[PDB]
Amino acid sequence: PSLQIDIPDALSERDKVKFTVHTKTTLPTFQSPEFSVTRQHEDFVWLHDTLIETTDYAGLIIPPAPTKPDFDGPREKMQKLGEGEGSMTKEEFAKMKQELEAEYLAVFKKTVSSHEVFLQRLSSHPVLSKDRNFHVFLEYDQDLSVRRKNTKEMFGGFFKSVVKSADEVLFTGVKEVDDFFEQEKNFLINYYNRIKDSCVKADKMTRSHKNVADDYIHTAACLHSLALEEPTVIKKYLLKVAELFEKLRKVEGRVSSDEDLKLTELLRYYMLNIEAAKDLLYRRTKALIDYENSNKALDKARLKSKDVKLAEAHQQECCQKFEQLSESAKEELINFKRKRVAAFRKNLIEMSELEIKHARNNVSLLQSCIDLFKNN
Amino acid sequence: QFDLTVGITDPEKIGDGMNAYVAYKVTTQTSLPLFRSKQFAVKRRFSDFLGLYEKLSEKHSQNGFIVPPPPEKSLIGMTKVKVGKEDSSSAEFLEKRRAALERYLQRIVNHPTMLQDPDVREFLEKEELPRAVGTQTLSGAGLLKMFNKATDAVSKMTIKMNESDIWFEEKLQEVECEEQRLRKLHAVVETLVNHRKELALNTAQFAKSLAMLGSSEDNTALSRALSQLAEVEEKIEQLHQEQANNDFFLLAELLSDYIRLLAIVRAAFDQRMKTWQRWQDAQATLQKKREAEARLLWANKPDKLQQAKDEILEWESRVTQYERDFERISTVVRKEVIRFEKEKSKDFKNHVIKYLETLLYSQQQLAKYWEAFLPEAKAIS
Amino acid sequence: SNVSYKYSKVEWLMEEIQLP
Numbered sequence: 039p040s041l042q043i044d045i046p047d048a049l050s051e052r053d054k055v056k057f058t059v060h061t062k063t064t065l066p067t068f069q070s071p072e073f074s075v076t077r078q079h080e081d082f083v084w085l086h087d088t089l090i091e092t093t094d095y096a097g098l099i100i101p102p103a104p105t106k107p108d109f110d111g112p113r114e115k116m117q118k119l120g121e122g123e124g125s126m127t128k129e130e131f132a133k134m135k136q137e138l139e140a141e142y143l144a145v146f147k148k149t150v151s152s153h154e155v156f157l158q159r160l161s162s163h164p165v166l167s168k169d170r171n172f173h174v175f176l177e178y179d180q181d182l183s184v185r186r187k188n189t190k191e192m193f194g195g196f197f198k199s200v201v202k203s204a205d206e207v208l209f210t211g212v213k214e215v216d217d218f219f220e221q222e223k224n225f226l227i228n229y230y231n232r233i234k235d236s237c238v239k240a241d242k243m244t245r246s247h248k249n250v251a252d253d254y255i256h257t258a259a260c261l262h263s264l265a266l267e268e269p270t271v272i273k274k275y276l277l278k279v280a281e282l283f284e285k286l287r288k289v290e291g292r293v294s295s296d297e298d299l300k301l302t303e304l305l306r307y308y309m310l311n312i313e314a315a316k317d318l319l320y321r322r323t324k325a326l327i328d329y330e331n332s333n334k335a336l337d338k339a340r341l342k343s344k345d346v347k348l349a350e351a352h353q354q355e356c357c358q359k360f361e362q363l364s365e366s367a368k369e370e371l372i373n374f375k376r377k378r379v380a381a382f383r384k385n386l387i388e389m390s391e392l393e394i395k396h397a398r399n400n401v402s403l404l405q406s407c408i409d410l411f412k413n414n
Numbered sequence: 415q416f417d418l419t420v421g422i423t424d425p426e427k428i429g430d431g432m433n434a435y436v437a438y439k440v441t442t443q444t445s446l447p448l449f450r451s452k453q454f455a456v457k458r459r460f461s462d463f464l465g466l467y468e469k470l471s472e473k474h475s476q477n478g479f480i481v482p483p484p485p486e487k488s489l490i491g492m493t494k495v496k497v498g499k500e501d502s503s504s505a506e507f508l509e510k511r512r513a514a515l516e517r518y519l520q521r522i523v524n525h526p527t528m529l530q531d532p533d534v535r536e537f538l539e540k541e542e543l544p545r546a547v548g549t550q551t552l553s554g555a556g557l558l559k560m561f562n563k564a565t566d567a568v569s570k571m572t573i574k575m576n577e578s579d580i581w582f583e584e585k586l587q588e589v590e591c592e593e594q595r596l597r598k599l600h601a602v603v604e605t606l607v608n609h610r611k612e613l614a615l616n617t618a619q620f621a622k623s624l625a626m627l628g629s630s631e632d633n634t635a636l637s638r639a640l641s642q643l644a645e646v647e648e649k650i651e652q653l654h655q656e657q658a659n660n661d662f663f664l665l666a667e668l669l670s671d672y673i674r675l676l677a678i679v680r681a682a683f684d685q686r687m688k689t690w691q692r693w694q695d696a697q698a699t700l701q702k703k704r705e706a707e708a709r710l711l712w713a714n715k716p717d718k719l720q721q722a723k724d725e726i727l728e729w730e731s732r733v734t735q736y737e738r739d740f741e742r743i744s745t746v747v748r749k750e751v752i753r754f755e756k757e758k759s760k761d762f763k764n765h766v767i768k769y770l771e772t773l774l775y776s777q778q779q780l781a782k783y784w785e786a787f788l789p790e791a792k793a794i795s
Numbered sequence: 796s797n798v799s800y801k802y803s804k805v806e807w808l809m810e811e812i813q814l815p
Contacts (some may be wrong), residue, residue, distance in 0.1 A: 044804075046803065046804040047801065047802055047803040047804060048802050049799060049800070049801050049802070050799055050800050050802075051799050052797065052799070116798075139809070139811075142800065142809075143800075143802070143807075143809045146800070146802050146809065147802070147807065150802065228630070229630060232623075232626060232627065232630055235623060236620075236623035236624075236626070236627060239616070239619040239620055239623050240620055240623075242616050242619070243613070243616025243617055243619060243620050244616075245616075246609065246612040246613045246615070246616045247613050247616075249605075249609040249612060249613075250606065250609030250610050250612070250613050251609075252605075252609070253602060253603070253605040253606030253608075253609045253610075254606060256602035256605060256606075257599060257602035257603050257605075257606050259598070259599075259602065260595060260596075260598035260599025260600070260601070260602045260603075261599045263595045263598055263599070264592065264595035264596055264598065264599045266595070267588055267591055267592050267595070268592065268758075269755050269758065269759055271759040272758055272759050272762045272763075275762060275763055275766060279766055279770070282770070286773075301620070375632075379633055379636055382636060382640075383636070383639070383791075383794050386639060386640075386643060386791060387791045387792075390643075390784055390787055390788060390791055391788075393780070393784050394780075394781060394784035394785065394788070397777050397780030397781050397783075397784060398777070398780075398781050400773065400776075400777040400780070401774060401777030401778055401780070401781060404770055404771075404773040404774040404777055405774050405777075407770050408767055408770040408771050408774050411763050411764075411766055411767040411770065412767055414763060
């Protein structure tokens, strides 16, 4: 209760999302017990990078950075709808617009949630909740992200990636040493593919759901249009079914969005989280290769008896640096497992509740309409 | 309102190989003294309904009667039932065809003139005596079919008129607009069907990945809960698909029937115009006859004159017949539009309730599925 | 060219903001 963080709103400006980060605190390190600041996705990436680069946090499970907000799909569909406004009825256009606004809102809510969960994880951690760059990004001296005018720094960072990317690509062709990092590795290796496959299948399912929802709106339009010219007895009956499909469209689009949030997004998260755990194993074993490199250096140094202590010391630190990474690695992998079980359990529970909510909502909608006609 | 009800049930495959066909049990219940029994049933194959329509159309359509058309020849559905693959798409096709044959026959028996036709009421009484692989029948019926088709297209392409009075054309406007609105709503439901089907597939895929996730799980409780969630998804994907079939056979197909009936009132208006044209042509012929006499009044041949005076008397009668047919045909379209409207209000409400109950059953199933999984989610320790 | 949406928690509501 001493540091509570929520993201009550966000604003999607052109190619950017701004999050209102709201903080409530009883900690005397902050100037106010309640305050709000504006933050962009890049500020969360910077906070995450700074926490990873902090040497004293090397033995802590740093929460994964939130995913970049992707609105390109919903925005492209919204633009194409505006170009097509003259080819359809005002009622069809209004319906299709509402379905796309609901798709956009579902992506927007998943984005806000992922950013809030990242900050809440930092606030819940006994060390990271006291981090100066965290406190500065929350209730510190306003915002200190893009305060420096020069881009020269950005150009230098981009170059590192072209050179940096090669080191990671080269590192893929390596053979595990000793007896550590064995069975578990291929497991993550195996789970990532199963996670990725279940993610694209989930995405296809929800996108088919929205397609079905779109039909409901288009169907209610033709029903309404059809009911115009007709004997009055059936004319009113048809308007009640068009009114029905207008509402059913609203729940189907809603079940697609909640489906995208609880399942597809849960799977997206741990597809990148698995990738992060794999980088931990890569670094741990890197030490191993370093410890071999060091011995081959001592073996020759002892023969000439020149720099024995120097190559001895080198061997000692890569032996035990490996153990230091090995401790923090296992401490974080286990941490990951525990967090993944809680996440799956949480989303599965929530999804089930939402599925039941919408199912009952449709039952009452269809029930009342059926009981209406049976009792004309 | 005739006290006569027809039902079509029990789609049965009769025979084997290339000669195999589907028969339908046509049940009739009536108090009308024109039938020998108050209740009876006969077996009829899809081509027997086509033979009924052919005979009725030859007798009545040329006189301006709106003869209801039978459902279309689905070649694709006939191949599916013949290739012996006992599945779900063959049963859906047979039920769609049965329902459309039932409406078709209900229209025929609700019509005063057609109900009195010996081919409708009395042919309901004739042994089918089905036989297979007889070429001779194909050779004679088939030769006639190709020659007639060439004649029909040239006449249809060469002449295309409109209506005269608003009785058929004002009303003709309303009818043609309602068909536009039905095709709109119909095209939107067909996308709803596919979308649903497309949803059922994706739910089936998802269901499988969950079970694979539960198996990959290293936590027993999570494997159990995930495995159980997949079983819920498995049940839901069946609901989606069965609902999609109900969206098609209980809704989409319902609209298509009305579009099938509206086209039958359009054909009545078109037939009223064909009669008017033939009537006008007779008058033009009559004028040529009266002029043929006028020329001969100055000539000196009394025999050819009486020849002309007779052909005038004959065509005075003919033009009287074509005129009397035009009046009667104009009455048929009126009688037909009223029939289409009264039948709409009588049945439309129930057909909508039938479909809505199909969505109500689904949701009720959804609720029970998740209410049963809820306790299993809470049991995750 | 500059359609922006505001997402707010009071229950969440999304508002279109239109600025030419």
